[PDB]
């Protein structure tokens, strides 16, 4: 829904696989809390 | 009044504009720096969670009407106090009045000027545009004098138009050109490190 | 074409503004210039 | 040669039919809506009615 119909989003080209990163990403901190990535994947580090 | 910044008004198009500034000072306190409106309003994006700095390029995308500014319209930055932030700040504004069908010669002048040049030099009029240095005190002799130096500096070397650029003094662009990667970006964050 | 283009056009206001539109387009008239096709067949550029 | 020259009379004759090439306006009223935006029932509905 919030996505701009902007002439260099229907243009420009991204990785796919950094696009599925970024969704995962977007929800894993919001589950977290945590704003900071590096400091989510230093987490992520030790976690099982 | 003494020294605090340059603000600039960008219109993007229909309710869409830009503030770019250069704040002199960024040492005393800033945190979450505010957007104001007609001098006492509409504090418009207080997103930012980053500090501004000394004599360094912003730019921030706003969404204003050109109802109010067919009118004077004092639009102002608030460097936040860290608890309290009205006005108390060392505080900056500016207005923006616009009328159309004004003053039409001196912009189709420095389009004459472009014009006449990529026709001559090759290159395409946006990319003369793009590749031209522009500052405050830019005398138009030094400005030419940047673009010939450019396309001597790419004939030999044989090297990119922005890398000729870069040559030629020119800065690290932050923002995206051509819908692509900026220069900061793949020179620094392509990949992040880390 | 050198003299054309180290003039001092940007900050040049007044009667001064008007004498340098007559002397870069003695022939054309500016407001038949306006348009864009007019701008890409004056300059012998691409109207895209 | 003659030949040629015939060839750039029928282009030149297709040309004369299609007219001027229409220029492709960019710095147009489109603003960058958001989707939510540009997908409206009420967006549909105000055009129609």
Same mark, same amino acid.
């Given at each position: 829904?919030?996505?701009?119909? #902007?002439?260099?989003?229907?243009?420009?080209?991204? #990785?796919?696989?950094?696009?599925?990163?970024?969704?995962?990403?977007?929800?894993?901190?919001?589950?977290?809390?945590?704003?900071?990535?590096?400091?989510?994947?230093?987490?992520?580090?030790?976690?099982? | 009044?003494?020294?605090?910044? +340059?603000?600039?008004?960008?219109?993007?198009?229909?309710?869409?504009?830009?503030? !770019?500034?250069?704040?002199?000072?960024?040492?005393?306190?800033?945190?979450?720096?505010?957007?104001?409106?007609?001098?006492?309003?509409?504090?418009?994006?207080?997103? !930012?969670?980053?500090?501004?700095?000394?004599?360094?390029? +912003?730019?921030?995308?706003?969404?204003?009407?050109?109802?109010?500014?067919?009118?004077?319209?004092?639009?102002?930055?608030?460097?936040?106090?860290?608890?309290?932030?009205?006005?108390?700040?060392?505080?900056?504004?500016?207005?923006?009045?616009?009328?159309?069908?004004?003053?039409?010669?001196?912009?189709?002048?420095?389009?004459?000027?472009?014009?006449?040049?990529?026709?001559?030099?090759?290159?395409?009029?946006?990319?003369?545009?793009?590749?031209?240095?522009?500052?405050?005190?830019?005398?138009?002799?030094?400005?030419?004098?940047?673009?010939?130096?450019?396309?001597? +500096?790419?004939?030999?070397?044989?090297?990119?138009?922005?890398?000729?650029?870069?040559?030629?003094?020119?800065?690290?662009?932050?923002?995206? +050109?051509?819908?692509?990667?900026?220069?900061?970006?793949?020179?620094?964050?392509?990949?992040?490190? !880390? | 074409?050198?003299? =054309? &283009?180290?003039?001092?056009?940007?900050?040049?206001?007044?009667?001064? &503004?008007?004498?340098? &539109?007559?002397?870069?387009?003695?022939?054309?008239? =500016?407001?038949?210039?306006?348009?864009?096709?007019? &701008?890409?067949?004056?300059?012998?550029?691409?109207?895209? | 040669?003659?030949?040629?020259?015939?060839?750039?009379?029928?282009?030149?004759?297709?040309?004369?039919?299609?007219?001027?090439?229409?220029?492709?306006?960019?710095?147009?009223?489109?603003?960058?809506?958001?989707?939510?935006?540009?997908?409206?029932?009420?967006?549909?509905?105000?055009?129609?009615?």
């Amino acid at each position: 829904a919030k996505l701009v119909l #902007s002439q260099d989003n229907l243009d420009n080209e991204i #990785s796919a696989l950094s696009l599925a990163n970024e969704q995962l990403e977007t929800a894993l901190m919001a589950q977290t809390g945590k704003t900071d990535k590096n400091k989510y994947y230093e987490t992520l580090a030790t976690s099982r | 009044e003494k020294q605090a910044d +340059y603000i600039d008004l960008i219109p993007q198009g229909g309710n869409q504009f830009l503030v !770019n500034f250069s704040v002199k000072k960024t040492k005393k306190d800033a945190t979450h720096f505010s957007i104001g409106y007609n001098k006492s309003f509409n504090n418009l994006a207080d997103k !930012n969670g980053f500090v501004p700095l000394a004599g360094e390029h +912003y730019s921030i995308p706003v969404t204003l009407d050109a109802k109010i500014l067919e009118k004077k319209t004092k639009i102002g930055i608030t460097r936040k106090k860290p608890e309290p932030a009205s006005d108390e700040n060392h505080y900056t504004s500016a207005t923006f009045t616009i009328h159309p069908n004004a003053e039409p010669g001196i912009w189709l002048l420095r389009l004459n000027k472009t014009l006449r040049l990529a026709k001559v030099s090759g290159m395409t009029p946006h990319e003369t545009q793009h590749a031209l240095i522009h500052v405050r005190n830019d005398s138009s002799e030094y400005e030419l004098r940047r673009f010939t130096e450019t396309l001597l +500096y790419r004939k030999r070397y044989g090297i990119d138009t922005e890398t000729a650029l870069m040559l030629c003094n020119a800065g690290i662009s932050r923002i995206s +050109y051509d819908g692509q990667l900026s220069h900061f970006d793949r020179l620094f964050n392509n990949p992040p490190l !880390n | 074409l050198y003299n =054309i &283009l180290t003039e001092d056009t940007e900050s040049l206001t007044g009667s001064d &503004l008007e004498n340098s &539109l007559k002397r870069n387009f003695p022939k054309v008239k =500016i407001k038949d210039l306006m348009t864009l096709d007019a &701008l890409a067949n004056y300059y012998e550029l691409p109207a895209d | 040669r003659d030949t040629l020259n015939e060839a750039k009379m029928w282009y030149m004759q297709a040309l004369g039919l299609l007219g001027d090439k229409p220029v492709s306006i960019f710095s147009n009223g489109w603003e960058n809506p958001s989707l939510s935006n540009a997908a409206d029932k009420t967006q549909a509905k105000q055009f129609h009615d």
